[PDB]
Amino acid sequence: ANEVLLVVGGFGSQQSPIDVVEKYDPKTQEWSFLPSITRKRRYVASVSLHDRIYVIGGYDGRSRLSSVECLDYTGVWYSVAPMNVRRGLAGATTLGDMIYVSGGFDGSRRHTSMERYDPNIDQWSMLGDMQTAREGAGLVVASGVIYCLGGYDGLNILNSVEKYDPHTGHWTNVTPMATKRSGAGVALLNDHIYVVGGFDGTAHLSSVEAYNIRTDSWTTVTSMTTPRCYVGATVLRGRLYAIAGYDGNSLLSSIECYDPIIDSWEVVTSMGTQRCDAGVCVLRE
């Protein structure tokens, strides 16, 4: 019944992409290492699904990537089928028993497209396009529907939000966020979508907003302890964790935790690898 945090890859203090994989357990507050990924990837995404960690896309310093590798967490990494497109700073989520990845950047273009991974046939299928091309936007599932949030189209940091209805296969617009953010963290918690930090085009942000789904409205939440952009976000037993990132001067090694009980953020660790644009996901143990 006990979940843990996972952090893969990203951009490290030696200002290169890394291959470090870390586990963080919030109950003991201990860190540990898992086996490294095969290649070093910054700008990278990660999801877990049925006790399998997938590492998706990213950028190694020479090329952006379509490759994807896998680890049965119950440890050696192995390659599975590649995406149709090379994607860094892509959004990524799971729904049903599928992976969905959307947006990103191949080295020339930002993508509107979303593709989907089926572990039963080891194949990535392309789906319908978003209206806006987005890098640095997160994907989050709520009640069987996918939301893409904020990001960057090549010219503008975005406050726009789109939702994908699997019953229709179409994207539609939702009410936008109050502030434009790229590199923000996004997670679902108690039927609200939280967006934490990111970069609005001038300032690195500590600000947090929450989308009430039942009302189609956004509200300001308590700012984090420190600005963070290109930051991971995940929910673990009813609490929202902000993970590493860039504060606009330095790479963060700390995770902070938002407890709705106190409506407040607490640093729970100062000890991970400093890094940003890494992938994060939750593991059942």
Binding site: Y152, S182, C276
Partner: peptide, 8 residues
Amino acid sequence: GPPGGPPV
């Protein structure tokens, strides 16, 4: 360089 990133 994505917006708001560190120097490289």
